[PDB]
Write a protein that binds this ligand. Structure first.
Ligand SMILES: Cc1cc2nc3c(=O)[nH]c(=O)nc-3n(C[C@H](O)[C@H](O)[C@H](O)COP(=O)(O)OP(=O)(O)OC[C@H]3O[C@@H](n4cnc5c(N)ncnc54)[C@H](O)[C@@H]3O)c2cc1C
Ligand SMILES: Cc1cc2nc3c(=O)[nH]c(=O)nc-3n(C[C@H](O)[C@H](O)[C@H](O)COP(=O)(O)OP(=O)(O)OC[C@H]3O[C@@H](n4cnc5c(N)ncnc54)[C@H](O)[C@@H]3O)c2cc1C
Ligand SMILES: [Zn+2]
Ligand SMILES: [Zn+2]
Lengths: 466, 467
């Protein structure tokens, strides 16, 4: 809310940065407009310096200078984050990983990838798929998001159900600390219990404890067969039974289970001009499978589909194994958040709730907000108990905010849920962590922040309580 | 040797305080303290004069509060199956046992989330969840004695790591008592939760130097409908490696375990445990487990895999089982190797992560470097994860053999950019060889974490950071 007492960038600081990062000092005000605005376009900083280092040493030297000079630094990746973590609040120096985009090594047998933090996720997927491997995560933001940002936010995504957390799949990190110290935890071993797993501190730390410069990550083998079933369900009870039956009948080949409601389908059709491939339904389910024997997978899907259609769990369904149609079906899900931001002002909640009551809050909000909301939608990673809850309005209303908050957070706390399942904390959620974390946890978090960055130059105003 | 730090000593008043805090949970009899003072390998013995066995987290908090005010060192202990001396005192540290913290708090039969006290025995948790059609995400030969809290504190790997991955992924939450007795509630029984720093990760693999784990929330995989085991003899390590490659290519996602052992391992398990080999005599053996939803499909995958492996000469003889009894018999040949080794004599033990293509090199090397001074040299373990268990047995310890083994093995491993402790951890034994796997700045940051969380150093002194 109020700017902390950091120094201001002088002409000598600019000349120092030009010495440290020749060619990577952007000060043109019109060029700084895009990096000062967050993805949702509801936060806008006033930073006058963007730095674009090429190497880890340049990052170390930048932070050394900023530490001696007490200048605040805002690390930025693809700038697709949803919680205002990725843009300055005031005049923080924006340190971009855009030019830190080289792959350093890839072991064609172990599947271990070592790459710079600014490698774009989509580009890494292409790279490892050319070598019959895949990234352990994928996101709708794949085209822009940086692997460094994925690690910093502990991104979940669309294959989390199968491959799990970056806490498991990240094998090593090189991190530059606030004073410039380079911390080498960049091991490439599957198993290494030689002391504390320090890298874990930086996974989900959202740039407040250090700048991730190099990532080593375990890539799963590329599946021989990927199938997608897009199904229409006549209610949420049937969605939940489709999930239970899916786990019973598909089992280890399951790689994704996503859901969306009718209003989501209507919004992607309206704003993105994507047609539905199945009959109109109150709910849609996207199931992905990934396996090594295409025939066994096809048989599993056949028997699953036959039972689900036969027992009335699914009303209408389409299947795809062709890469093009698979991408078509996936686009209906991946681009929901975009269609929502085109419907007007978006109130965005990212909740972990018991799966059996994942949609209850959507119905509650629809009753609580009558004609004062444009739309209330629920979609997301049902398999992981993760609901994306969005409310759209024709314009922002402080009235509608008072109706939504704290109510939504209180409901989540009443379910012992998470008020930020995936997207993290950043600027937006720094003062609502008490609904998911007790004061002693938040206190230890503050102690770690003070140990690793005593001057608080890395990402001020985030991601700890005020 | 190592010098005792200036901690206080246990007085009669401390014994009365502990008797207040945990009624009936204070053991002072010297003959009773014998067993908890000796490590699993029986080569380290502490001189602790008090064992505390609390039942509840509040009791652990109050115990540690008292020890913090009094400057009394504390040695947390679970199943006491640890391999690196972390589990027993060096001098007179108070032994804090989780043996009586053995309750299951809750289990959700849909999400598969287990919440239980740290002292629940792994095998007993397995029986509990399997009755409900789930399994534990980890398994190990110590299952009969090790505590889930010990597994989290050591970041235990084990026999199904290849399928379900690290505890860093499968642990959903922890309740931890800090050195001053503060109860840290990170007990988040949620699949996903990005509300600040993932503090629990610090305590996974911290071996009781940053806090005492009292409650665990863990994700339990569903119980597989079909489990198969194949046990195969391979004529050389190259064929072992191609059997692994082929196994991944043909079994794929249903693979749940890949373990190897050498001929000497088989001989020792046969000689000491009287377990006959079910395949023709071979220089290497491989145990493969699969876990899947469809028996027919898994059987087809295994049949084709076996066809191709036997066809191209990667495997000389093989046997398969689905009957639970026979599956367990085959698993016993691998699980009980460590016991047979400790029955063979004094054991020099190394637990290394190496490039899989070079996993067995050190064994051949040491067989040549050592002579008749080694009774046996063996290599076995989690080949799918790049993890070698290297062991040398002899009739008795000798300084000469130790000098031939060390630092040579650790320098070899560093030469391969490997880990000198893949899964067993550091503890007392390996505290001064971390430089072979970790750079100075990381070790310093670890020391700063220790100073922040335990500035008095009462939790597991003389471990698991450098001196
Ligand atoms: C269409 C769309 C779909 C999405 N889908 C998902 C999804 O399925 N799951 C999910 O979890 N999220 C999802 N997200 C949001 C997600 O948080 C980001 O897309 C992703 O994590 C990558 O963020 P980024 O690379 O853009 O990092 P940025 O947005 O640039 O930064 C995010 C935060 O991390 C910090 N940071 C960035 N780079 C570094 C670095 N190198 N070192 C240290 N700190 C750094 C920033 O300071 C900021 O606090 C989606 C976003 C969009 C727009
Ligand atoms: C036959 C056999 C097979 C094994 N197989 C494997 C294997 O496959 N993979 C593997 O990784 N290891 C294996 N191990 C060793 C492994 O480290 C232990 O089996 C187990 O992980 C530790 O559990 P425990 O309760 O015995 O811990 P202990 O030995 O009692 O203690 C382990 C360490 O953690 C600390 N600690 C214990 N409980 C707590 C707690 N509640 N809170 C904080 N700190 C605590 C102790 O102070 C000590 O430093 C095996 C051991 C044996 C004997
Ligand atoms: Zn998401
Ligand atoms: Zn092992």
């Amino acid at each position: 809310v109020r700017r902390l007492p950091f120094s201001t960038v002088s002409k000598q600081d600019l000349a120092a940065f030009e010495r440290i990062v020749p060619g990577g000092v952007v000060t043109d005000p019109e060029a700084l407009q895009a990096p000062n605005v967050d993805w949702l376009r509801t936060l806008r900083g006033c930073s006058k310096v963007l730095l674009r280092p090429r190497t880890s040493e340049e990052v170390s030297h930048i932070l050394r200078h900023c530490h001696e000079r007490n200048l605040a630094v805002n690390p930025q990746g693809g700038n697709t984050g949803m919680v205002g973590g990725s843009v300055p609040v005031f005049d923080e120096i924006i340190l971009s990983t855009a030019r830190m985009n080289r792959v350093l090594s890839f072991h064609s047998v172990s599947g271990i990838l070592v790459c710079q933090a600014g490698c774009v996720l989509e580009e890494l997927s292409r790279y490892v798929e050319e070598r019959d491997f895949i990234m352990p995560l994928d996101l709708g933001a794949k085209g822009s998001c940086h692997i460094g940002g994925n690690v910093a936010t502990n991104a979940g995504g669309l294959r989390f159900l199968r491959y799990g957390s970056l806490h498991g799949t990240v094998l090593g990190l090189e991190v530059v600390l606030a004073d410039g110290t380079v911390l080498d935890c960049l091991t490439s071993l599957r198993k290494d219990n030689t002391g504390y797993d320090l890298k874990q501190l930086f996974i989900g730390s959202e740039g407040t404890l250090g700048i991730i410069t190099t990532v080593s990550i375990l890539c799963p083998p590329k599946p021989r067969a990927v199938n997608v079933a897009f199904l229409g369900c006549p209610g949420f009870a049937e969605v939940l039974q489709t999930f239970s039956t899916c786990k019973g009948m598909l089992g280890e080949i399951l790689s994704a289970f996503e859901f969306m409601d009718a209003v989501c389908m209507q919004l992607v059709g309206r704003h993105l001009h994507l047609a539905s491939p199945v009959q109109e339904s109150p709910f849609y389910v996207l199931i992905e499978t990934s396996g090594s024997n295409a025939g066994h997978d096809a048989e599993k899907l056949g028997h699953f589909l036959e039972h689900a259609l036969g027992s009335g769990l699914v009303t209408d369904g389409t299947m795809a194994t062709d890469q093009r149609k698979v991408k078509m079906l996936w686009a209906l899900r991946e681009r929901i958040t975009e269609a929502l931001s085109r419907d007007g002002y978006v109130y965005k909640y990212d909740l972990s709730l018991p799966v059996e009551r994942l949609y209850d809050i959507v119905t509650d909000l629809r009753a609580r907000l009558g004609p004062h909301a444009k739309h209330v939608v629920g979609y997301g990673h049902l398999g992981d108990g993760n609901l994306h809850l969005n409310v759209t309005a024709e314009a922002f209303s402080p009235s509608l905010l008072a109706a939504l908050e704290p109510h939504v957070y209180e409901w989540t706390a009443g379910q012992q849920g998470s008020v930020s399942a995936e997207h993290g904390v950043g600027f937006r959620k720094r003062d609502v962590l008490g609904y998911s974390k007790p004061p002693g946890a938040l206190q230890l978090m503050q102690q770690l922040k003070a140990l690793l960055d005593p001057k608080g130059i890395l990402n001020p105003y985030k991601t700890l309580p005020s």
